[PDB]
Each structure stands twice: as C-alpha cells, then as structure tokens.
Amino acid sequence: ERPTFYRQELNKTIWEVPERYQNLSPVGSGAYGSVCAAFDTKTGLRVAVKKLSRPFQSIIHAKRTYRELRLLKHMKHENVIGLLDVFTPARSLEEFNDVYLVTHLMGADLNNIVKCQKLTDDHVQFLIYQILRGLKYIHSADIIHRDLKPSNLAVNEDCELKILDFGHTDDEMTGYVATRWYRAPEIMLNWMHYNQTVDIWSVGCIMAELLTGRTLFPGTDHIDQLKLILRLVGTPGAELLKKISSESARNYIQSLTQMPKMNFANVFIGANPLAVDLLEKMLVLDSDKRITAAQALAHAYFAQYHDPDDEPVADPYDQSFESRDLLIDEWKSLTYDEVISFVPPP
Ligand SMILES: CS(=O)(=O)c1ccc(Cl)c(-c2n[nH]c3nc(Oc4ccc(F)cc4F)ncc23)c1
C-alpha cells in the first residue's frame, strides 16, 4: 500500500518522502551526493537517504541510475552497503522521475578515523578483515568495486565496517589527489583489461596507511606515483611486460631503469611480520599473482577473526544489461520495475 508522502526543501531541491522518515538533515556537505540523515520511525533505524539527481537526463545517466539500483538491490552482506528502502512519490511510470535510496546511517568514513595516525595492529586486523569479507562477497558476484579508498569505507563507533560506492573524470585524477593514490597501476595507466584484483591492490594501500598513518603512494601525478610504486615492488619482469597489451604503456615502462623489489620488513618497521607478509602478497605488480579476497581471509594475520562458515558469497548477479544498448525510456522502465518490485529486508 502506498504511504503518504510529505514535501520539504533541502539540498536546493524538493524532497518528497514517506512520513516514516523524519528529521531529514543534509550530511557530507556534497561529498556523498544529495544525501540526508533521517530517523526511520518504522524500524527505529538512523538512515541515510540519497536522492538521485536528474536520473534520466541522458542514456548514460539513465543506465547509471539502473546500474546503481541493480547493484544496491543485490548487496545483502554485513560489510557491504545494502538497500533498506527505495521509493518514488510517482504513482505511475509516466510521472516517474525521482529515485530515493535508503541505507544505514554510518558514523564516519575511514579517512576521518585514520587522521594522520597509526592504528593498533588489532584495529588494523579487524578493519581489514571486514573489508576483505565484504570484497569476497562482492567479487563472488563478479562485481568489481574499482574505486576502494578510505572515504568509501564507512564505520561506526564499534569499528563495524561497510563498503560504499561499489560498481571519475580526468581532472579529478590529476595531481596530488587521494582519488588516484589507491588505484592499481594497471588501471591508473590503462595497461590491460583489468580484473577483481585491482581491489586487492587498493586494500594493500589502505592496510599500509592504517599501519603507518601515512599514504603508501602519495604521487604528485600519474608518473610520480608509478615511480613510487615501482621503487617498492620493483620494475615489471618480462612476464608482466607481455601482459601489458597497451604497446604505448609497455614501451614507456621499459624506458625506466630496472629496480628490485624492496624488503617490506625494512619498509614497514615495527609492523607485525604477518601484516608484512600479507602486504607483500597484496601489493604484487602482476595482478594475476595477487592474493584474492577469499585467500587473504585465510591468511594467519586474521586468525582471531577468520571463520570459513561465516564468510558468505553472493547470489548470482545478472549484469548482461551492461553490454545492452537501450533508449532512455527503456532504461527508465527497467529502473521503475526494480523500484516497484523492491522487498525490504527483515
Ligand atoms: C554521521 S554522518 O555525517 O551522517 C555520516 C558520516 C559518514 C558516512 Cl559514510 C555517512 C553515511 N551513512 N550511510 C551512508 N550512505 C551513503 O550513501 C548511500 C548509499 C546507498 C543508499 F541507499 C543511500 C545512501 F545515502 N553515504 C554516506 C553515508 C554518514
């Protein structure tokens, strides 16, 4: 049955939401999108409500809207942001033009927690364990995050973690920016068609930063960052070179003076030797040889948290729509169907 909706001006747009959602207050100051905190009187939950901006203005935007709804509707895991609710004030497909997404309100993002500070090894174990647990779930559905970084890792005061934004312009990847610091080199420099292990590179970067309080590869640009990466992990061998399908990228790589891999125990002084070992297995230049999420969970570093029976995989995720070319109204109808058919979690 259709709830009663009420109207309110918030982020210079009119939010129209069910009565159950009270005390809407904008959060993140633009960083999370058009997002409000609210109290869900039906569940007693503090929630985050995201209103999608002009979701069907173009083919690209319409498909992107469908993509996000599909992704969020699929994710049902403790360490992954899922959907508590999705709604539209529209009574039919013809008046459908706004999409509102509801999830748990989290306390902070990881960036605001690390705050130039070393975390205790125990805190690192727990946070990384949860990230890896969430990624095992995400990867098992053949979904890649592609953009893991502290700012899309949300945490409560109990240190319980959820991953946001799973599934950027040139200007915002330019220069001394956190938007690029956690990216695998193969994706940063378009070496090849990339796979799930790009996310593992990001975890390695995050893990190191939690351990030292410092960005692992704070490159001032793409080239500076590559040099920082290669100084640590060594220049690519012949084997990886072959796999760089971009002739241009491969040619540039070979112009660099060869460097051996550094000793991680000398790089991460004082760190748990098990943490060093895992970092070594995550920060492998050849993505084929990086540890997977499922493998990392079984690493001795997570002994006090690892439970093979409590690390679920995902239902199959049909993403055949990604290779599909459709019109705006067709993407819009597909999205509408997904909104209408939503069933809230117990
Ligand atoms: C205490 S706070 O300032 O309100 C705060 C701080 C940091 C974060 Cl990460 C958050 C936060 N909690 N839950 C979120 N969800 C999103 O994005 C959404 C993702 C899918 C949805 F269905 C709906 C969303 F709003 N963004 C940010 C958040 C809140």
One-character DSSP codes across 152-193:
GEEE-TT--EEE-S----SGGGSSS-HHHHTS-HHHHTT-S-
Atom of ligand 1 nearest to the CA of 48: 25
Q: How far is the CA of 32 from the centre of ligand 1 (A)?
A: 7
Q: What is the CATH number of domain 108-313?
A: 1.10.510.10
Other Cβ atoms within 10 Å of 178 Cβ, number: 12
Cβ of 106 less than 6 Å from ligand 1? yes
Please report, for residues 68, 142, 188, 198, the alpha-carbon distance to residue 292 in angstroms, rounded to integers and kept in the order given: 25, 13, 20, 10
Please report, for residues 125, 172, 204, 222, 303, the alpha-carbon distance to residue 306 in angstroms, rounded to integers and kept in the order given: 10, 37, 18, 36, 5
Distance between CA atoms of residues 28 and 32, nearest Å: 6
Cβ of 48 less than 6 Å from ligand 1? yes
Other Cβ atoms within 10 Å of 174 Cβ, number: 12
Cβ of 154 less than 6 Å from ligand 1? yes
Atom of ligand 1 nearest to the CA of 154: 9
- Provide φ and ψ at 107, rounded to 5°: -75, -45
304 and 35 Cβ atoms separated by less than 8 Å: no
Name the closest-CA residue to atom 7, ligand 1.
108
Cβ of 72 less than 6 Å from ligand 1? yes
**82, two tokens:** 């899922």
Distance between CA atoms of residues 272 and 280, nearest Å: 13
Distance between CA atoms of residues 303 and 307, nearest Å: 9
**Angle (nearest 5°) at CA 131 between 288 and 72:** 95
Decide if 40 is catalytic: no
Name the closest-CA residue to atom 13, ligand 1.
105
Give the bridge partners for 47, in sequence order: 38, 104
Atom of ligand 1 nearest to the CA of 36: 25
Name the closest-CA residue to atom 20, ligand 1.
103
Mutate to test the pocket of ligand 1, among 164, 166, 342 (most ligand atoms within 8 A of CB): 164
Binding-site residue set for ATP: 27-35, 50
Range(s) within the chain of domains with CATH label 1.10.510.10: 108-313
Which method was it determined by?
Answer: X-ray
Taking the alpha carbons at both ends of the chain, their separation in whole angstroms is 18
Mutate to test the pocket of ligand 1, among 24, 34, 35 (most ligand atoms within 8 A of CB): 35
Atom of ligand 1 nearest to the CA of 104: 13
- Cβ-in-10-Å burial (0-12, 13-18, 19+) of 240 comes to buried
Q: How far is the CA of 106 from the centre of ligand 1 (A)?
A: 6
Return the DSSP state at 10. Answer: -
Fold of 1-107+314-343: Phosphorylase Kinase; domain 1 (3.30.200)
Resolution (angstroms) stands at 2.0
Distance between CA atoms of residues 71 and 245, nearest Å: 30
Please list the alpha-helical segments (H only) found in the chain. Answer: 59-74, 110-114, 121-140, 178-181, 185-188, 198-212, 222-233, 238-243, 247-254, 264-267, 273-282, 293-297, 328-340
Give 221's contacts (C-beta < 8 A, 6+ positions apart): 174, 175, 176
Other Cβ atoms within 10 Å of 90 Cβ, number: 16
Name the closest-CA residue to atom 15, ligand 1.
48
Range(s) within the chain of domains with CATH label 3.30.200.20: 1-107+314-343
Nearest to 272 by CA among 124, 114, 160, 116: 124
Distance between CA atoms of residues 85 and 104, nearest Å: 10
Nearest to 185 by CA among 229, 243, 246: 229
Other Cβ atoms within 10 Å of 194 Cβ, number: 16
Q: Which of the following is catalytic: 40, 147, 165, 199? A: 165
When computed from its CA atoms, the radius of gyration of the chain, rounded to whole angstroms, is 21
SS3 140: helix
Give 309's contacts (C-beta < 8 A, 6+ positions apart): none
- Cβ-in-10-Å burial (0-12, 13-18, 19+) of 301 comes to buried
